[PDB]
Write a protein that binds this ligand. Structure first.
Ligand SMILES: Cc1cc(C2=C(c3ccc(O)c(C)c3)[C@H]3[C@@H](S(=O)(=O)Oc4ccccc4)C[C@@H]2[S@@]3=O)ccc1O
Ligand SMILES: Cc1cc(C2=C(c3ccc(O)c(C)c3)[C@H]3[C@@H](S(=O)(=O)Oc4ccccc4)C[C@@H]2[S@@]3=O)ccc1O
Lengths: 236, 10, 233, 9
């Protein structure tokens, strides 16, 4: 497996190169926001992001070595976590705001337009604030996002052993980055733990979010793409 | 089958 | 503060001594969905009481406001119960040891509707711990991490200083076990990523448990109800 | 809340 034969610097480059672009929303500033119209905006955006995610996942070292069925499972489990970590990453330099898109930067007061959304909005803001405090680097971000993809669905499955070897290698890569950044040996393991523990809160935000998304569906608030419907149904 | 499944190929 | 002056060995020792006892259920060989749920609820309720006094013995926890202590427990209680369950189930492949006199396999978990999926996730976690050969000293560190980390939302800094201390402790345990540097970092990562799955299980289970509270399946205790209510608002 | 009481005593 070439995934395992990559050096740390090689891991970083591949992951950086695989990064998806930032997309714009179809935000139309001619009309006031409603619950439905904002959910419509976020849904459409998320759907276009999903297509890019799928192609990004294929470029995560080791991922294409898994059966089609395991690739499906991992993405079904992690998709929202992945959308969310990307959102908090690009919102980092926007304190108090979430940059859903360059043309869709929202504060919590706008988040309140959608029933039950502001609570999760608040958790996302706090995570972005946390990443900002830690001075999260791009190289570290792409490692975490890949860890989420490989880890979040591994416990619900040989194939599992392969996944853990890749994960170990991303750990090596994270430490490598931190040491190269000049952190002491102790600072390295402490920062590793801090970043990984944040993944627990990202899981939490995903689980909570999924509940509301399902709710919005069964309340016909907004039309969902068939892809989105399948991803949602996978969590039920 | 699933749309995800097909997308992971195309 | 005290928790920050503690050594790795002291931290380990403080946590070991703080461990709550293993409780029995009042089960007698006679098994409806209401029977099994009642035993588990009764059990969990009594475990909660011990957990609270255990939390107070976790270094640094008492330095926090009463308000923050409440928030951390409200957020983490089911995660703590679950990791407790998987730990003691380690040496019982395919079975969950809720209590010494209540050992259950997955087919029995099917007795309660929707419970088997959570059942299966807990089993896979226990199996994971078994394959990693999780040590008691590592387990107490992980459980304390869950308490302090899961809801950490001045106060946060103190919480983060303690968390770092516990990370140092975990690494100390591994270096002491003979693990190389690379192996220490890898094992630390592995253990911490498992907490993500433990969070996931708590969220899924909380979802079901509330579905039962409104269905009146079984009389959840007052304390349990308040713990469950905290995850709704 | 009960939890509050238990944390005190
Ligand atoms: C586009 C996008 C949106 C979001 C968020 C929400 C959202 C909205 C619509 C939608 O179709 C999807 C997939 C997500 C909402 C929430 S969610 O994922 O938990 O979904 C919710 C929708 C309504 C209420 C609560 C949650 C997080 C952020 S915004 O606060 C997060 C990341 C992201 O890339
Ligand atoms: C006693 C005890 C039970 C459990 C589990 C369940 C359970 C049961 C009753 C109850 O009052 C509580 C608090 C938990 C069930 C699940 S739960 O936490 O998700 O609660 C569920 C109850 C019914 C269906 C699904 C989940 C995990 C294990 S058993 O599979 C976990 C840890 C533990 O210490």
């Amino acid at each position: 497996s070439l995934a395992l034969s990559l050096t740390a610097d090689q891991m970083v480059s591949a992951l950086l190169d695989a990064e998806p672009p930032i997309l714009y929303s179809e935000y139309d500033p001619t009309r006031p926001f409603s619950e439905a119209s904002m959910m419509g905006l976020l849904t459409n955006l998320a759907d276009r992001e999903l297509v890019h995610m799928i192609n990004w996942a294929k470029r995560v070292p080791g991922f294409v070595d898994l059966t089609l069925h395991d690739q499906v499972h991992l993405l079904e489990c992690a998709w929202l976590e992945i959308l969310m970590i990307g959102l908090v990453w690009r919102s980092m330099e926007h304190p108090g705001k979430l940059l859903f898109a360059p043309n869709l930067l929202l504060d919590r007061n706008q988040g309140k337009c959608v029933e039950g959304m502001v609570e999760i909005f608040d958790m996302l803001l706090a995570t972005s604030s946390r990443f900002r405090m830690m001075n999260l680097q791009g190289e570290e971000f792409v490692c975490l996002k890949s860890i989420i993809l490989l880890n979040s669905g591994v416990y619900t499955f040989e194939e599992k052993d392969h996944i853990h070897r890749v994960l170990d290698k991303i750990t090596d890569t994270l430490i490598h980055l931190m040491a190269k950044a000049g952190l002491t040996l102790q600072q390295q393991h402490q920062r590793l733990a801090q970043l990984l523990l944040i993944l627990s809160h990202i899981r939490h935000m995903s689980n909570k979010g999924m509940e509301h998304l399902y709710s919005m569906k069964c309340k016909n608030v907004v039309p969902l793409s068939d892809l989105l419907l399948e991803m949602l149904d996978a969590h039920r | 089958h699933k749309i995800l499944h097909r997308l992971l190929q195309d």
